[PDB]
Design a protein around this nucleic acid. Sequence first.
DNA 1: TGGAGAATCCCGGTGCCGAGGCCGCTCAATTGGTCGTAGACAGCTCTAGCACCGCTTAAACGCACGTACGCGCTGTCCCCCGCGTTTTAACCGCCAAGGGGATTACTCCCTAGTCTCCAGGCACGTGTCAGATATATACATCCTG
DNA 2: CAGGATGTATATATCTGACACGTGCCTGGAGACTAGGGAGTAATCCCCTTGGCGGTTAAAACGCGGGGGACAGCGCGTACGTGCGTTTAAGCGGTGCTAGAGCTGTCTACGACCAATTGAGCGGCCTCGGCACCGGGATTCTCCA
Lengths: 94, 96, 96, 102, 179, 233, 103, 78, 78
Amino acid sequence: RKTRKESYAIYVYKVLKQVHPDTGISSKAMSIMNSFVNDVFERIAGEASRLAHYNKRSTITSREIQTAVRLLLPGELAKHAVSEGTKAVTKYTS
Amino acid sequence: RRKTRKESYAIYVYKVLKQVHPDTGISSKAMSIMNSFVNDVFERIAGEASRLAHYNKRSTITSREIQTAVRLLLPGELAKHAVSEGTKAVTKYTSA
Amino acid sequence: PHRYRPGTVALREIRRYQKSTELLIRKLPFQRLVREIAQDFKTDLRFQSSAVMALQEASEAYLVALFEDTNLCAIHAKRVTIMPKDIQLARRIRGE
Amino acid sequence: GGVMKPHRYRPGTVALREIRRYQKSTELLIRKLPFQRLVREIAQDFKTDLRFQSSAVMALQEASEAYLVALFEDTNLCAIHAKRVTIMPKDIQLARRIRGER
Amino acid sequence: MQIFVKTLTGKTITLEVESSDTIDNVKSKIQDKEGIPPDQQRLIFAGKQLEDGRTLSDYNIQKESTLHLVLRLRGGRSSRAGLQFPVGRVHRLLRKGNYAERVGAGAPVYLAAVLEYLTAEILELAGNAARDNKKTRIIPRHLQLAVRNDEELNKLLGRVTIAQGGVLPNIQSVLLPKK
Amino acid sequence: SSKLPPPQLFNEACRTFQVISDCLYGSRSSDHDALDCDCAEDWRDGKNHACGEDSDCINRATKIECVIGDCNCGEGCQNQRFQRKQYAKVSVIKTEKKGYGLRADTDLQPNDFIYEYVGEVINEPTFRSRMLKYDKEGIKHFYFMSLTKNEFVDATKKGNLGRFCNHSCNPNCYVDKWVVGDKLRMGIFAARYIKAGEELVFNYNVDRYGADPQPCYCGEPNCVGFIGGKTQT
Amino acid sequence: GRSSRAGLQFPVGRVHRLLRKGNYAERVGAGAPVYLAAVLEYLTAEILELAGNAARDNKKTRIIPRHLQLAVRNDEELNKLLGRVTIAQGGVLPNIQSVLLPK
Amino acid sequence: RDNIQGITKPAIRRLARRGGVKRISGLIYEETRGVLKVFLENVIRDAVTYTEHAKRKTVTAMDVVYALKRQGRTLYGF
Amino acid sequence: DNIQGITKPAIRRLARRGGVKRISGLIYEETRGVLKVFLENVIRDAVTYTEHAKRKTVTAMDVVYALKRQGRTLYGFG
DNA sequence: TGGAGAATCCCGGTGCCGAGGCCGCTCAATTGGTCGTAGACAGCTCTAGCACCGCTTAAACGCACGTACGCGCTGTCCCCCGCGTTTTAACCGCCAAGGGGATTACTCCCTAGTCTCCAGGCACGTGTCAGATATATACATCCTG
DNA sequence: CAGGATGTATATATCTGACACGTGCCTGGAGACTAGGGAGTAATCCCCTTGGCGGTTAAAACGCGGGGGACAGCGCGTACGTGCGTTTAAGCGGTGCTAGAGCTGTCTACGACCAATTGAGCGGCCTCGGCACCGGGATTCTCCA
Ligand SMILES: [Zn+2]
Ligand SMILES: [Zn+2]
Ligand SMILES: [Zn+2]
């Protein structure tokens, strides 16, 4: 008797347990992280959408996501993010 | 052989200019600027209507969503007259 | 009769309020301000508590950033106090 | 006989004359070819043998000149605020700080 | 208070009005003298379309001000709505522009109306700026003046750069010589 | 002051010429089109000057003069004065060593229009021709001033009342370039307080081609005995 | 699960569903949600790691908004990515200008 | 009414202390109240526009967040 | 070195369009540094668009979109 | 400079509600087929970008000169700060209607997709005009005898 | 001392480059019809908003002394504006060459799409410990003798 409201809570919690062994996270901090993830998702997906539109393409492929990540993240963040993206796609196709 | 059919708002901006000031012309670069302006305003209003449809879990951009986008984008009397013009247009269109 | 110099209390308050994290405007007066501003658009509006908290957070953060830049202007003009024309300068540089 | 040199213009008069002349006109104020060489040098550090369309270099020159003009407008306002009439590096750094580019 | 109302045909009529008069009243006065129905009247002053409900005082309209009269046009899918801009092309751009799964029937008509109105407003301000500078061809400079001189359009277009447009003539008072 | 205290004519007076007040130059410029400013007047009958002589009007602040009739202020624009002659009051006093002085006739407010130096504007080969014919004729007074670096002015042929001046190492007036009708012109202006009676003498700053000038009779400790220019031409 | 196959903790299925139903393109490539989930995991991991470090530096084991704020503002590239972002209950950095300090 | 004076002088002084201000001119308080009135007027206007479009009678937290998002001052946590 | 190709008189003219009356001699190095940062960011984003589109030429549309991404949208090129 | 004094920090003790985990459930995620259009790729064409070169000349450059403006100092004075005392209203807990957000049930009209048809819009010649240019032409300069 | 050839400013018939209008053509827009699903509307519930009340006490208001920082004048020196003359790349046009943008054709891999299934993940409730708060001493900073 309550509408399903999805979130990123459990995944941010999994990442927190993988990076920090003994550390918890408050409700408000989890809300901030959830809104942050939805925000960055909206930014990257919007940038990939407009990038696909510009080049007269109708499909968001790995290339559009890669270029949008290089466009939005400054410097070293972009370098490590493109490394992580390529790693993930390499593992996933295998 | 012609090169490629590329669309623009050139002739419509020219018709509006001839409707408001018949003895006035416009430079080609100024027509380009006007085309970029129309495409810009279009992209902003369509983006805001898209966000409005998304936030309210709806999959249809109707005249109401465009109207709300217009009220958000134009500061004041521009919005009031834009809503007046849009209301006139939609009314005359659906009632004929 | 032991008094602090005019300014050390300012620095201790700066360290205190920059160290803590809580809303600095009184809740109920701010809620009356919000409802009063909302009256001139639609009559008998209701507000969720979280919406008023979000407004208070955005209001405090915007004022904090404005006062920080106003302070940088004040220090730039070889002063340590802020004047109205510094706030007007800061908002002008920002683009309003 | 002799040439009789009179008094020149006071400092600032020719400056204000330039102010009015350049605020009334619209031509580009940066030399096109040196700026194009600057663009190609900056682009060199990302992809070798990059080519540019003339309209791209022109759009970059317009954007660059508009950005610098707006920055100098803001710098002039902060400078005039500080009871001076001469902009200094601190003024531009303050402008960029308040704008959020730093 | 004497004011003038100028038509696009260039005729000026003179009205006598007070700061307490509403724009509705002024339009009524204009119908009396000129014969134009108020519903067709659109008044502009200080780069602002004037609101029927407001008073001349609200707009700081003083002695000898000139208000500009523009007539609002009452009355293919474009011809059915009395618009110049292409409703069909707007509909196609909305469907194939990836903005929503579905697009309403009234949305392209409304959007084309808003686009044509904004285009007409900026071209009117540009035309007036070009005519006041004794030129007959609209140039980027006149568009730049049209945008930066109208407060509302300036607000809407504060972060855009108009190519080859320059800036508004603005010299700080302090730069001028002293007494 | 009243140091240069029977006024003389123009044509105990100096050598004769023709009094001019208009543009009667050699051939001609300045090419700077001054457009019609939106200056608020405060002028219907002359209660206050429209483009005011010491207020903040954008034309007068940059040594630019409005043409008569095209500025928005109409004819009450006080920044039209080269075309309407709002000159000050001087006269020609005979002095046995300083020659001929422009004695002030009314007590003059500082930083205002005093007079205009008008004559014949010519170029360099005709200018050195004038120099050669005049020092072969044997004149002892030389009016070979330079409007710009290229052109030159001379007033002994067809000039006006601005001839009767000299050099003083302490100037009271000065001369500055203005523009009127796309024509570069010269105007002498005061800077200090000027009382009726003393000659209005400024810094010539001459680069004389000769070797023996007349001595600077200013008699001040700031005077080096001679005038003092820029180059030793 | 496709998440474990790609070595990610973020749900590639959920990301893919949001992409399809988010009106971004008519078609969504299979590698796109995997790549996007990877980038989201990296950004989340960086911010959480810095907030955790700051929390230990404040003798707390539970991350609160103030620690997220310190984490965001002490990373120059995150500050550039989040220059228009405001963190609720975050506060401000302890920055006192030199000219105000006693002499 | 005149309830905008509810934001009092020491609360503005507190905000300024958090902003790094050390001394405050007496006119700063009225200037800050006016600036805040303008800012809140714009944000509440956008919020009410979102609320009226959604056919709701209560301005929710999401309307305020999206309104702030439209002005490039996005807020996390609501 | 080509950043010195944007010569000092040109920088003065740029300030002249901005309304600046007197310019310190130290301004020019700061202005060239600012110009370098701005052009670096816009050109970097343009090159990112070209590398995505598999084209070797920076097109006008790429520059317009790159500028638009940084909130400095440019009219008059498409 | 050091002792007094105020403020803040640290360190343990208690209470508490919210983080963190489990349990039941449901619908969204995953898998397997099935297909249809997007795009990858090779090839070809033709525009336009880069490279070079000569020539002209407008702007950049370097130095000289001078003034006016920046900057440091000093006096004045006044306004905001520190603080004490008084007051007011925010705040916290508790309660009581009840409005309206959210969900349900079910219908129905509006819009995507398809098919049919033709004229509106775009690329391109063709004519026309602000604005710049080579050219007859009047008056002053040198030019040799 | 003397005209002729020459240089110069002036008005000019013309040349150029950008803009208005007519021409063929094609592809996308308009009209017509159908299906299905999003949404519109009635109906019900129940969360959480609004309103109220009362006691606490902390913050706000208010008043006053005083100090130090804002502001204005003065004075001083140096650096930047203006200008002149020298030089050099900028600009323009003219020429040549080929890289690559842009379009097309064909094919295929890849994702849309649909049905069945099942477990991942979400709501509810339940538990205990990190933290919020408090008190007492300890350090730390400030200021006036
Ligand atoms: Zn004027
Ligand atoms: Zn005038
Ligand atoms: Zn002397």
